[PDB]
Amino acid sequence: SWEAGVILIALGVFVLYLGVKLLK
Amino acid sequence: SWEAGVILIALGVFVLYLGVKLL
C-alpha cells in the first residue's frame, strides 16, 4: 500500500494547486 | 470563480489526508 498513498497525495496536491490557480 | 478554487482546495486537503493515512 505504498503506491496508493503516493497517488492519492499527488492527486490532492494537484487539486489544491488548481484551487490556488483559480485565485487568479 | 473564487469559490470554485476554494472548494477545490478543500477537496485537495481531504484527498491528501486520505493519501497520507493510506501510508
Side-chain angles (χ1 to χ4, degrees), chain A residues 2 4-6 8-9 11-13 15-16 18-20 22-23, chain B residues 1 4-6 8-9 11-13 15-16 18-20 22-23:
Chain A
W2 87 273
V6 171
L8 287 176
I9 286 178
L11 188 59
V13 169
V15 178
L16 186 140
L18 263 54
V20 172
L22 293 179
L23 303 186
Chain B
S1 61
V6 174
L8 286 176
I9 289 177
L11 284 167
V13 169
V15 177
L16 187 72
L18 268 55
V20 172
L22 200 47
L23 301 185

